[PDB]
Amino acid sequence: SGFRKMAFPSGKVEGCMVQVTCGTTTLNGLWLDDVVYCPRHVICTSEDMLNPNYEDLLIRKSNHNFLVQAGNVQLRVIGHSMQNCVLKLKVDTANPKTPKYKFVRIQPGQTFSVLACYNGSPSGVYQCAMRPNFTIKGSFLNGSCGSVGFNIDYDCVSFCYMHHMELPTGVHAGTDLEGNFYGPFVDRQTAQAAGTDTTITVNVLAWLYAAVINGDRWFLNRFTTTLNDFNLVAMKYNYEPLTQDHVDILGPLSAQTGIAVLDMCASLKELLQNGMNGRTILGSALLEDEFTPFDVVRQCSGVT
Amino acid sequence: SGFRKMAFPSGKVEGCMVQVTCGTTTLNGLWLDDVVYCPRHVICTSEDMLNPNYEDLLIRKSNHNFLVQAGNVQLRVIGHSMQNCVLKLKVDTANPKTPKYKFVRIQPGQTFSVLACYNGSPSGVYQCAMRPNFTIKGSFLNGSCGSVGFNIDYDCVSFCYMHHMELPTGVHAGTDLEGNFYGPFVDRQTAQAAGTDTTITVNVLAWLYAAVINGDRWFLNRFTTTLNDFNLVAMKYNYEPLTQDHVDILGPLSAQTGIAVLDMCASLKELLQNGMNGRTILGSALLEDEFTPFDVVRQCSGVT
Ligand SMILES: C#CCCCNC(=O)C[C@H](Cc1ccc(F)cc1)NC(=O)[C@@H](Cc1ccc(Cl)cc1Cl)NC(=O)[C@H](N)Cc1ccccc1C#N
Ligand SMILES: C#CCCCNC(=O)C[C@H](Cc1ccc(F)cc1)NC(=O)[C@@H](Cc1ccc(Cl)cc1Cl)NC(=O)[C@H](N)Cc1ccccc1C#N
């Protein structure tokens, strides 16, 4: 029993973190086989960051302008290329700690673990969701750029995020591992705004199912609702519309608890309309939306 | 910027997790140099668990009654001993992945990371505090026994917890790595109750300092209070008394924000008396008490 924000074990990713230096700028890189992946703004100065032309800045660099450190051992760069917003540095040594891995680009509402690093050295691990507005509410200080997000599936590491920048609101924006930003953002030091966020409805429902699995039932009721009437309420409270694909994803948890999805929607609706009234759910005084249906199944038991 | 429940990177501990089997009972073990550490109730049957005599049960066992698996490779047990509530199994192979490490017994209110494992295989990582009543609010399923809690300091792994059991309330109890339980608990399948818990005052204050560091100020006020008048309020709301050692621990955060400790106590008092009134602090609708002063400094920047 119990329910915690749980990250994947980070060891397979720890053995891939390196430090990349170009001029005075240092950030983190990801070392897989013989290629090091990092944000391309490592090739920028403070002046270049205002409005950079990266093709221009990179053509002015050679392999020896880049310093790669793995532990204390320095790696030799034998080639370099740019792919979207990530820099690829070919090195002379294949990383012997390279896990089985894939690059995947995730959908808003999916979760992943972040291994926050500074100067190539892992400092901590936490759980994140990709918000509907394509930012993440991370914990990142200067020098965290190049930290990656990932999921693990049977010793295959699926990398899905690389950290690039913090926006004026304090939230964070980055790319997939092929350098494509999540959301409309671009890698220049201009003030960019995220669109207004919404609550990840399917995740709030998964977490309500987690609460039932752990014996929390005070919020349930006998009422049920329709998909359409619930979505009217969702709109009113800035919740993502609930799709039928989302109803179907919640199937396993619905069956394991006996509570039909649209039955749980009536409880959420009532929770949205009446608040918690001082009570808590799984130790929280607000509705949590950074657990997917998959996260709940993985962490919870197969029996209530 | 940002503030997350952050665990230590788990890789150094991942390379130490093994599976220990005795009869039909399997749980997790910790493999350091040539010794495997695990809960002693691995030598129990379902019948033995009601009221075991462990010296009796262990004298009836030989080395070959214990199966140790590291990955798929089986380890050979060449000796065994009991120390308090942990079993020590000597094996023929020193763990080549043994980190620099120490065993430490922590105080209530301190935090640590848990690497939850099943059948010797790590499944996830999360942050925990030792509650004042010497339980932890973990996330543990059957088979998690032997999972360990740890802190990391400059590549030294300080192990401080081994998981043994879940109590009727759903919270969890375990030992230090020398087998001494935290709290009054014993390792038999009787219904034991934890004492009533209290809120970790010094940690709530550290977290309020975290909020200021991240630009959250709506809860501050101009009032200050005395240590004695605050402790009257603490008692009323089931908060640990605040000691002078605790005031002094909060020194660095006080200086970095300019807010004196007893100044922050007046804000906490007002928060305790008036509630949040719908607002949140670092994304939470209640006062968080599982971040130590040290956790806040480690995760936050040196400048507000
Ligand atoms: C609550 C709350 C808000 C608190 C105040 N928040 C900030 O002051 C962060 C601040 C906000 C901001 C945004 C646009 C601006 F015009 C001016 C300022 N963001 C940065 O200064 C950007 C500027 C930048 C560099 C490079 C590129 Cl490609 C894009 C961008 Cl936007 N620096 C970084 O993101 C570092 N790579 C990494 C870094 C540095 C410093 C602090 C954190 C990080 C991280 N992580
Ligand atoms: C909300 C809420 C509460 C929900 C209901 N909670 C439970 O049903 C857990 C249940 C509560 C309980 C306590 C005392 C009893 F008399 C009877 C039952 N606890 C267990 O069944 C103990 C019994 C036990 C075994 C060995 C020793 Cl040494 C001591 C103890 Cl007490 N089993 C374990 O702790 C496994 N080692 C590991 C394990 C098994 C199953 C589930 C979780 C775990 C873990 N982690």
To the nearest 10°, report the CA torsion of A148, A123, A186, A39. Answer: -70
Residue of A172, A215, A285 with shortest CB distance to B286: A285
Q: For ligand 1, what atom is nearest to the CA of residue A190?
A: 16
Identify the CA nearest to B184 among candidates B238, B139, B133.
Answer: B133
Strand A73-75 versus strand A25-32 pairing type: unpaired
Q: How far is the CA of B141 from the centre of ligand 2 (A)?
A: 9
Dihedral over Cα of B139, A128, B153, A33: its sign? positive
Contact at 8 Å (CB) between B228 and B217? no
Question: At a CB cut-off of 8 Å and minimum separation 6, what does B225 contact?
Answer: B262, B265, B266, B269
Residue of B4, B166, B284 with shortest CB distance to A1: B166
A194 lines ligand 1 (CB under 6 A): no
Dihedral over Cα of A127, A233, A272, B3: its sign? positive
CB contact under 8 A, A11 and B12: yes
CA B274 to chain centre: 31
Cα separation, A236 vs A288, in Å, equals 18
Identify the CA nearest to B122 among candidates B100, B156, B146.
Answer: B146
Return the DSSP state at B199. B
Residue A261 main-chain phi, psi, to 5 deg: -55, -50
Residue B91 main-chain phi, psi, to 5 deg: -120, 165
The H-or-E segment that residue B94 falls in is none
Cα separation, B253 vs B211, in Å, equals 11
Q: At what angle do helices A201-213 and A261-274 cross, to 10 degrees?
A: 100
Closest ligand to C-alpha of residue B301 is 1
Decide if A145 is catalytic. yes
Residue of B2, B9, B139 with shortest CB distance to A139: B2
Residue of A10, A126, A166 with shortest CB distance to B1: A166
Cα separation, B117 vs B120, in Å, equals 6
CB contact under 8 A, A116 and B283: no
Q: Of all protein residues, whose CA lies closest to atom 2 belonging to ligand 2?
A: B170
Residues of chain B positioned with their CB less than 8 A from the CB of A214:
170
CB contact under 8 A, B170 and A2: yes
Cα separation, B40 vs B85, in Å, equals 6
CB contact under 8 A, A10 and B5: no
First vs last Cα of chain A: how many Å apart?
A: 9
CB contact under 8 A, A123 and B9: yes
If DSSP codes are grouped into helix, strand and coil, which group holds residue B159? strand
Q: Of all protein residues, whose CA lies closest to atom 38 belonging to ligand 2?
A: B142
Side chain identity at residue B133, one-letter code = N
Residue B139 main-chain phi, psi, to 5 deg: -130, 100
Contact at 8 Å (CB) between A40 and A54? yes
Residues of chain A positioned with their CB less than 8 A from the CB of B215:
170
Two tokens at B44?
Answer: 């129990």
Burial of B152 (0-12, 13-18, 19+ CB in 10 A): buried
**Catalytic residue selected from A16, A22, A38, A41:** A41
Return the DSSP state at A232. H
Return the DSSP state at B2. -
Place of tokens 């040539």: B34
CB contact under 8 A, A4 and B126: yes
Contact at 8 Å (CB) between B136 and B171? yes
Question: At a CB cut-off of 8 Å and minimum separation 6, what does A238 contact?
Answer: A196, A198, A199
Domains and CATH numbers, chain A: 1-14+100-197 (2.40.10.10), 15-99 (2.40.10.10), 198-301 (1.10.1840.10)
Dihedral over Cα of A161, A163, A167, A172: its sign? positive
Neighbours of B74 (CB within 10 A): 12
Q: Of all protein residues, whose CA lies closest to atom 11 belonging to ligand 2?
A: B168
Burial of A154 (0-12, 13-18, 19+ CB in 10 A): exposed
Question: At a CB cut-off of 8 Å and minimum separation 6, what does A166 contact?
Answer: A140, A172, A173, B1
Question: At a CB cut-off of 8 Å and minimum separation 6, what does A244 contact?
Answer: A227
B189 lines ligand 2 (CB under 6 A): yes
Q: Of all protein residues, whose CA lies closest to atom 18 belonging to ligand 2?
A: B168
A25 lines ligand 1 (CB under 6 A): no
Contact at 8 Å (CB) between B111 and B150? no
Cα separation, B93 vs A137, in Å, equals 44
Residues of chain B positioned with their CB less than 8 A from the CB of A9:
10-11, 14, 115, 122-125
Cα separation, B48 vs A87, in Å, equals 61
CA dist A115 to A190, A296, B117, Å?
26, 21, 19
Q: How far is the CA of A168 from the centre of ligand 1 (A)?
A: 7
